[PDB]
Scaffold this motif. Structure first.
Motif, PDB file in Angstrom:
ATOM      1  N   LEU A 256       0.592 -12.624   2.570  1.00 27.72           N
ATOM      2  CA  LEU A 256       1.307 -12.510   1.307  1.00 27.72           C
ATOM      3  C   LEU A 256       1.006 -11.142   0.698  1.00 27.72           C
ATOM      4  CD1 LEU A 256       0.285 -16.047   0.025  1.00 27.72           C
ATOM      5  CD2 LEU A 256       2.592 -15.390   0.660  1.00 27.72           C
ATOM      6  N   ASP A 257       1.950 -10.609  -0.078  1.00 27.23           N
ATOM      7  CA  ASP A 257       1.787  -9.315  -0.746  1.00 27.23           C
ATOM      8  C   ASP A 257       0.409  -9.128  -1.383  1.00 27.23           C
ATOM      9  OD1 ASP A 257       4.302  -8.349  -0.116  1.00 27.23           O
ATOM     10  OD2 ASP A 257       5.217  -9.004  -2.008  1.00 27.23           O
ATOM     11  N   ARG A 258       0.027 -10.062  -2.247  1.00 25.31           N
ATOM     12  CA  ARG A 258      -1.217  -9.958  -3.007  1.00 25.31           C
ATOM     13  C   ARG A 258      -2.481  -9.922  -2.134  1.00 25.31           C
ATOM     14  NH1 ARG A 258       0.432 -15.596  -3.549  1.00 25.31           N
ATOM     15  NH2 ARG A 258      -1.312 -16.987  -3.017  1.00 25.31           N
ATOM     16  N   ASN A 259      -2.376 -10.363  -0.882  1.00 24.60           N
ATOM     17  CA  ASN A 259      -3.546 -10.425  -0.005  1.00 24.60           C
ATOM     18  C   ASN A 259      -3.620  -9.273   0.996  1.00 24.60           C
ATOM     19  OD1 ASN A 259      -4.686 -12.746  -1.146  1.00 24.60           O
ATOM     20  ND2 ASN A 259      -3.437 -14.106   0.137  1.00 24.60           N
ATOM     21  N   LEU A 260      -2.707  -8.318   0.870  1.00 24.50           N
ATOM     22  CA  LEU A 260      -2.683  -7.169   1.770  1.00 24.50           C
ATOM     23  C   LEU A 260      -3.997  -6.373   1.847  1.00 24.50           C
ATOM     24  CD1 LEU A 260      -1.171  -5.201   3.689  1.00 24.50           C
ATOM     25  CD2 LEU A 260      -0.591  -3.949   1.623  1.00 24.50           C
ATOM     26  N   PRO A 261      -4.616  -6.046   0.693  1.00 23.89           N
ATOM     27  CA  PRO A 261      -5.880  -5.302   0.804  1.00 23.89           C
ATOM     28  C   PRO A 261      -6.967  -6.082   1.544  1.00 23.89           C
ATOM     29  CG  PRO A 261      -5.013  -5.158  -1.429  1.00 23.89           C
ATOM     30  CD  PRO A 261      -4.187  -6.189  -0.713  1.00 23.89           C
ATOM     31  N   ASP A 262      -7.038  -7.393   1.325  1.00 26.16           N
ATOM     32  CA  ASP A 262      -8.006  -8.234   2.033  1.00 26.16           C
ATOM     33  C   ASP A 262      -7.739  -8.251   3.534  1.00 26.16           C
ATOM     34  OD1 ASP A 262      -9.557  -9.318  -0.238  1.00 26.16           O
ATOM     35  OD2 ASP A 262      -7.650 -10.244  -0.787  1.00 26.16           O
ATOM     36  N   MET A 263      -6.465  -8.269   3.906  1.00 25.61           N
ATOM     37  CA  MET A 263      -6.093  -8.262   5.317  1.00 25.61           C
ATOM     38  C   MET A 263      -6.583  -6.987   5.996  1.00 25.61           C
ATOM     39  SD  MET A 263      -2.379  -8.910   7.121  1.00 25.61           S
ATOM     40  CE  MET A 263      -1.615  -7.304   6.873  1.00 25.61           C
ATOM     41  N   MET A 264      -6.334  -5.843   5.363  1.00 27.73           N
ATOM     42  CA  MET A 264      -6.751  -4.558   5.927  1.00 27.73           C
ATOM     43  C   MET A 264      -8.276  -4.384   5.925  1.00 27.73           C
ATOM     44  SD  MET A 264      -3.796  -3.934   6.841  1.00 27.73           S
ATOM     45  CE  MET A 264      -4.273  -2.534   7.853  1.00 27.73           C
ATOM     46  N   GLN A 265      -8.956  -4.951   4.924  1.00 24.55           N
ATOM     47  CA  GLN A 265     -10.419  -4.992   4.948  1.00 24.55           C
ATOM     48  C   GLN A 265     -10.897  -5.726   6.194  1.00 24.55           C
ATOM     49  OE1 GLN A 265     -11.454  -2.466   2.208  1.00 24.55           O
ATOM     50  NE2 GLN A 265     -13.052  -3.695   3.195  1.00 24.55           N
ATOM     51  N   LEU A 266     -10.222  -6.822   6.527  1.00 24.83           N
ATOM     52  CA  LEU A 266     -10.590  -7.589   7.713  1.00 24.83           C
ATOM     53  C   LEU A 266     -10.363  -6.760   8.974  1.00 24.83           C
ATOM     54  CD1 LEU A 266      -9.253 -11.122   6.720  1.00 24.83           C
ATOM     55  CD2 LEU A 266     -11.602 -10.636   7.403  1.00 24.83           C
ATOM     56  N   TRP A 267      -9.199  -6.118   9.079  1.00 24.84           N
ATOM     57  CA  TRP A 267      -8.934  -5.266  10.239  1.00 24.84           C
ATOM     58  C   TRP A 267      -9.987  -4.166  10.352  1.00 24.84           C
ATOM     59  CZ3 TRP A 267      -7.167  -6.835  14.327  1.00 24.84           C
ATOM     60  CH2 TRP A 267      -5.979  -7.558  14.464  1.00 24.84           C
ATOM     61  N   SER A 268     -10.373  -3.593   9.217  1.00 22.48           N
ATOM     62  CA  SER A 268     -11.364  -2.522   9.247  1.00 22.48           C
ATOM     63  C   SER A 268     -12.693  -3.003   9.824  1.00 22.48           C
ATOM     64  CB  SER A 268     -11.554  -1.903   7.861  1.00 22.48           C
ATOM     65  OG  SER A 268     -12.519  -0.866   7.919  1.00 22.48           O
ATOM     66  N   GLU A 269     -13.151  -4.177   9.395  1.00 22.83           N
ATOM     67  CA  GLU A 269     -14.408  -4.718   9.905  1.00 22.83           C
ATOM     68  C   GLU A 269     -14.304  -5.119  11.374  1.00 22.83           C
ATOM     69  OE1 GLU A 269     -16.428  -4.541   7.216  1.00 22.83           O
ATOM     70  OE2 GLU A 269     -18.170  -4.577   8.557  1.00 22.83           O
ATOM     71  N   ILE A 270     -13.175  -5.706  11.752  1.00 25.55           N
ATOM     72  CA  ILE A 270     -12.956  -6.109  13.138  1.00 25.55           C
ATOM     73  C   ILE A 270     -12.973  -4.898  14.069  1.00 25.55           C
ATOM     74  CG2 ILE A 270     -11.210  -6.999  14.731  1.00 25.55           C
ATOM     75  CD1 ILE A 270     -10.483  -8.976  12.326  1.00 25.55           C
ATOM     76  N   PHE A 271     -12.383  -3.795  13.620  1.00 27.85           N
ATOM     77  CA  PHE A 271     -12.406  -2.559  14.394  1.00 27.85           C
ATOM     78  C   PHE A 271     -13.777  -1.889  14.412  1.00 27.85           C
ATOM     79  CE2 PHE A 271      -8.349  -0.735  15.995  1.00 27.85           C
ATOM     80  CZ  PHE A 271      -7.574  -1.876  15.853  1.00 27.85           C
ATOM     81  N   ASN A 272     -14.519  -2.003  13.316  1.00 34.05           N
ATOM     82  CA  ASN A 272     -15.798  -1.295  13.202  1.00 34.05           C
ATOM     83  C   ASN A 272     -17.051  -2.088  13.575  1.00 34.05           C
ATOM     84  OD1 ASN A 272     -14.713   1.245  12.494  1.00 34.05           O
ATOM     85  ND2 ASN A 272     -14.424   0.535  10.382  1.00 34.05           N
ATOM     86  N   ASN A 273     -17.103  -3.365  13.203  1.00 31.58           N
ATOM     87  CA  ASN A 273     -18.302  -4.165  13.460  1.00 31.58           C
ATOM     88  C   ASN A 273     -18.073  -5.585  14.002  1.00 31.58           C
ATOM     89  OD1 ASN A 273     -20.487  -2.241  12.277  1.00 31.58           O
ATOM     90  ND2 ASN A 273     -18.974  -2.394  10.623  1.00 31.58           N
ATOM     91  N   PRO A 274     -17.346  -5.718  15.126  1.00 31.68           N
ATOM     92  CA  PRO A 274     -17.073  -7.063  15.653  1.00 31.68           C
ATOM     93  C   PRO A 274     -18.332  -7.741  16.207  1.00 31.68           C
ATOM     94  CG  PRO A 274     -16.371  -5.395  17.241  1.00 31.68           C
ATOM     95  CD  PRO A 274     -16.814  -4.653  16.001  1.00 31.68           C
ATOM     96  N   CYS A 275     -18.460  -9.054  16.076  1.00 33.14           N
ATOM     97  CA  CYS A 275     -19.719  -9.683  16.441  1.00 33.14           C
ATOM     98  C   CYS A 275     -19.765 -10.061  17.899  1.00 33.14           C
ATOM     99  CB  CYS A 275     -20.058 -10.816  15.478  1.00 33.14           C
ATOM    100  SG  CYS A 275     -20.649 -10.072  13.987  1.00 33.14           S
TER     101      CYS A 275
END
Ligand SMILES: [Zn+2]
Length: 981
Positions: A635-654
């Motif tokens: 959803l529009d309002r959750n876009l920044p949270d989505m990209m925060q998730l992508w950033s962590e997945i790209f940078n620090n995946p477990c």
């Protein structure tokens, strides 16, 4: 606007024999629902008026079989074989090629049969409406059309009565293949045992060992009893005017009938006093499946059904659900048992839960964990943020724009409507959500009480366990050979003669070219000469990373894709890329463990996934692009949270999460193995094509039988650490901005925030030589870095995968030419021509296979295939004869026009707002390239068709590959040119 026009209908309005009974705005779905009843027959009608050019019609009949002959399924095939107004053979398949339909089919559920089509052309809609109405209400039901579609006794050579009699028939083989899927066997038995009193106790599709009990007269009787408009539900959706639909339905069908009270009621299942348990068997692939299921209320109580569906999701959906933690994390199995969760196709719904892939010594432990989990949920209830995540998930399902809304809606309301429920209540999601929320606010123990009532204290509970039998199908064949022998020996001399003559008669009717001037048809001139241009803006971002922006009416949704090249990855790691992709978004990221990560993804996105792709070049057979596609929506309002998730997945995946990794691996391997029969023809063609192009070889590695077998190996490893350590190696060559492009689809008003969120993501990931010596920069119509293998040489291989199947799946692939080659358009038309005029008749109609045809891929691979085929050798022979037929040029201009209509039906199918620009983003084809191809398709002539047949498909002209999934075949086994796998 259509929805506004429909608001003008008044209660009591009379339209072409119907009366308007209700008019309801459903603003959350941008539609107006109009309920009507036919005055003389009482037939029920629902019209959903919405500004959507992809209009749909469906008619539904309540069909209640009382045996396992498959009569309603066989009837569904047979009514499409000819009717009073269209007595020509096979109106349905012929209309497939005389229309620009977006969907045309028919489905048989347990207790209803549904006949839907959709199209964006209003004349086409009227044409298809007349054919469907005539087929369902006034069918031919000819004895020989049944023999073809259902079952028959036939000499192996119909013109030689000294050859043995065998069983044949389309549905016969269709159902053999359906129950090659062991989950489908389990699912069928579950329903039959849980609801044993009435129609739900039988196999509605047809138990193959029961099909030959069906008689022609029984078939006709079933039609007379169930195919009356008083027993039907009519449905339309879209922006075409309702009045024209009602006028056709009344004048072409309903006016010929009077009201009856159908003898088709499905009574309530009487609840048990004590639980029951059963054991069954099923084919080979230690691997026991066990489930526990509970009878739930009548689905016509719509809010209660809604409540229980959500409850079932809370219980079973994702790694944070109680049953997942108790059963999947237990490590007792590989995955949930089939039909886990809420099942609402039957008059009474049911919930199911359990495991597959369990060691038989663990059955009692699994059953105990199920009971312990129920008690715990009753006591503690659910986490509030999980409930919010679920309601968020429903909002996404409500807002997301799909191209097949009409089909989704009629399929969704079908079962409730079948039992005289009110389908309009099912459309009022906003009300249902608000009432659900109010029910949580007013009673803090609401969901716990529901679990206690329907799970803890419910005696109507079934435990079903299933264990493999290594000779399952062999025993079936032995029984079949036995029943065959009994039938044959019972034949009088007259009977044998009738069978011989009717067999010859059927073969004749299947062979003789027939007049089809009966059917309506569109013309090639009804195809649009050009397509609307797709507007997109490419912006270099975070330096030089191209981002493609496509403004679309997404209804407040954002769709993000990133594509990262695989060119620097050491080739030894390539087979582990699909596994990497499947676990990348699931192992935890940064400070978020795998459970916290799952909750955030469910709460903030509609999903986040990675998948490997091989994208063939448009102009060169031995050039391709390889990479990983990252895809997400929110959803529009959750876009920044989505990209925060992508950033962590790209940078620090477990990648240290070894425990959950093992769970994911075993789930994936189980699912891949289970899906083989359903996609058998795809696995065959992937194997057949793998030696034809470099891309083909890579595709086998990514998604072919090789990948299924690799996953199964990995799932059996005692120490998974050496695999797990490959993941960081892959991350290094993939999770960075060194070789990336992205795409964004959103509303024009959401675009500005998105550009910023995307730029931040790109700046947040790592920056700063291809393992192949020959990489080429292909500009668009964004520079893409492709691999070219200029010294690749195709070669022929023939592979038979020995499978314990009662049917076969066959593929033959032929290397031809890429998309931009002018001959490509001709070969594309040829694939549909050959399918429609040759392969369908030989392989399905005559042979009895469920599917047979030819297709051409973007990569230039011409594929002939069969699906649920009783034959192998004869099918390969038919492939050869198909090519001989094509080279002979013995087809008409009308056949060619119809092939074009068919191709354009596919090509011009609606594209969702979320998917606009993807052709450009993935394959790099511009609108200018597509339009050139479109013009070439329009120019395909008879002479070009016979030329490309000779040039590419003839023996020795191009390299071929062959593959078969199926049981032992003596002739193949003795042929050293075949590899047995
Ligand atoms: Zn069927």
């Amino acid at each position: 606007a259509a929805c506004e026009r429909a608001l003008q209908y008044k209660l009591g309005d009379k339209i072409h024999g119907f009366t308007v009974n209700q008019v309801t705005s459903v603003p959350e779905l941008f539609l107006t629902a109009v309920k009507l009843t036919h005055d003389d027959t009482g037939a029920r009608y629902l019209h959903l008026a919405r500004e959507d050019t992809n209009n749909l019609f469906s008619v539904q009949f309540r069909t209640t079989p009382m045996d396992s002959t498959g009569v309603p399924h066989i009837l569904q095939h047979t009514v499409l074989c000819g009717s009073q107004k269209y007595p020509c053979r096979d109106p349905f398949f012929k209309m497939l090629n005389r229309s620009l339909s977006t969907f045309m089919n028919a489905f048989t559920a347990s207790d209803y049969t549904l006949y839907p089509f959709s199209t964006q052309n209003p004349k086409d809609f009227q044409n298809l409406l007349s054919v469907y109405l005539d087929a369902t209400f006034f069918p031919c039901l000819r004895e020989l059309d049944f023999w073809q579609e259902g079952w028959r006794l036939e000499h192996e050579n119909p013109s030689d009565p000294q050859t043995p009699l065998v069983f044949k028939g389309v549905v016969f083989n269709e159902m053999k293949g359906a129950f090659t899927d062991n989950e489908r066997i389990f699912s069928q038995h579950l329903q039959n045992r849980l609801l044993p009193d009435h129609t739900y106790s039988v196999v509605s599709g047809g138990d193959p060992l029961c099909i030959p009990e069906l008689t022609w007269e029984q078939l006709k009787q079933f039609h007379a009893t169930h195919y009356h408009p008083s027993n039907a539900r009519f449905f339309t959706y879209g922006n075409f005017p309702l009045e024209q639909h009602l006028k056709q339905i009344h004048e072409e069908a309903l006016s010929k009938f009077q009201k009856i009270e159908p003898s088709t009621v499905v009574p309530a299942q009487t609840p048990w006093d004590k639980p029951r348990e059963f054991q069954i068997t099923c084919g080979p692939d230690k691997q026991t499946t066990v489930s526990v299921s509970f009878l739930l209320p009548d689905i016509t109580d719509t809010f209660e059904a809604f409540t229980l569906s959500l409850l079932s999701s809370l219980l079973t959906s994702g790694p944070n659900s109680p049953f997942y933690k108790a059963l999947i994390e237990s490590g007792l199995g590989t995955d949930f048992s089939p039909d886990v969760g809420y099942n609402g196709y039957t008059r009474e719904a049911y919930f199911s839960v359990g495991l597959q892939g369990i060691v038989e010594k663990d059955i009692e432990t699994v059953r105990s964990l199920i009971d312990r989990t129920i008690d715990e949920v009753v006591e503690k209830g659910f986490e509030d943020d999980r409930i919010e995540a679920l309601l968020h998930k429903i909002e996404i399902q409500m807002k997301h724009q799909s191209t097949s809304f009409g089909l989704m809606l009629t399929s969704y309301i079908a079962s409730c409507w079948n039992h005289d429920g009110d389908p309009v209540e099912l459309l009022k999601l906003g009300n249902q959500l608000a009432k659900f929320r109010q029910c949580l606010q007013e009673n803090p123990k609401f969901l716990q009480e529901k679990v206690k009532q329907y799970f803890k204290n419910n005696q109507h509970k079934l435990t079903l366990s299933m264990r493999p039998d290594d000779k399952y199908h062999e025993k079936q064949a032995q029984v079949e050979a036995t029943k065959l022998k009994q039938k044959v020996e019972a034949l009088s001399p007259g009977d044998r003669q009738q069978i011989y003559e009717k067999g010859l008669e059927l073969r004749s009717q299947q062979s003789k070219p027939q007049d089809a001037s009966c059917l309506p048809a569109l013309k090639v001139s009804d195809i649009e000469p050009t397509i609307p241009v797709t507007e997109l803006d490419v912006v270099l971002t975070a330096g030089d990373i191209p981002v493609q922006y496509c403004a679309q009416p997404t209804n407040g949704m954002v769709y993000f894709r990133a594509f990262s090249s695989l060119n620097t990855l050491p080739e030894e790691l390539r087979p582990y890329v699909p596994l990497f992709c499947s676990v990348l978004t699931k192992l935890g990221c940064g400070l978020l463990d795998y459970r916290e990560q799952a909750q955030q993804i469910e709460l903030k996105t509609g999903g986040m996934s990675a998948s490997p792709h091989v994208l063939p070049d448009d102009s060169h057979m031995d050039t391709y692009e390889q990479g990983v596609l990252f895809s997400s929506l929110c959803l529009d309002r959750n876009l920044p949270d989505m990209m925060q998730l992508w950033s962590e997945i790209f940078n620090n995946p477990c990648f240290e999460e070894e425990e959950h990794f093992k769970v994911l691996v075993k789930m994936t391997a189980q699912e891949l193995a289970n899906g083989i029969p359903d996609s058998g023809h795809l696995y065959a063609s992937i194997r057949a094509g793998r030696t034809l192009t470099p891309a083909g070889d890579l595709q086998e590695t990514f998604s072919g039988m090789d990948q299924v077998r690799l996953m199964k190996r990995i799932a059996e490893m005692t120490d998974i650490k050496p695999i797990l350590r490959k993941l960081p190696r892959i991350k290094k060559h993939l999770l960075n901005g060194d070789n990336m492009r992205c795409s964004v689809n959103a509303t024009p008003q959401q675009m500005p925030q998105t550009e910023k969120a995307v730029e931040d993501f790109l700046r947040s990931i790592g920056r700063s030589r291809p393992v192949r010596p020959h990489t080429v920069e292909k500009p668009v119509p964004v520079i893409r870095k492709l691999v070219m293998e200029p010294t690749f040489k195709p070669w022929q291989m023939k592979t038979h995968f020995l499978m314990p199947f009662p049917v076969n799946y066959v593929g033959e692939c032929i290397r031809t030419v890429p998309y931009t080659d002018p001959d490509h358009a001709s070969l594309k038309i040829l694939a549909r021509l050959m399918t429609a005029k040759f392969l369908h008749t030989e392989i399905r109609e005559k042979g009895g296979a469920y599917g047979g045809g030819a297709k051409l891929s973007h990569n230039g691979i011409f594929t002939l295939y069969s699906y649920r085929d009783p034959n192998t050798i004869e099918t390969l022979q038919s492939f050869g004869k198909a090519v001989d037929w094509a080279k002979s040029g013995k087809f008409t201009q009308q056949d060619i026009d119809e092939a074009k209509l068919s191709v354009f039906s596919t090509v011009d199918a609606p594209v969702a707002p979320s998917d606009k620009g993807m052709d450009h983003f993935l394959y790099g084809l511009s609108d200018e390239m597509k339009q050139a191809h479109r013009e070439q398709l329009f120019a395909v002539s008879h002479d070009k068709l016979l030329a490309v047949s000779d040039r590419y498909l003839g023996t020795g002209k191009s390299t071929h590959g062959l593959a078969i999934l199926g049981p032992e075949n003596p002739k193949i086994a003795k042929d050293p040119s075949w590899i047995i796998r």
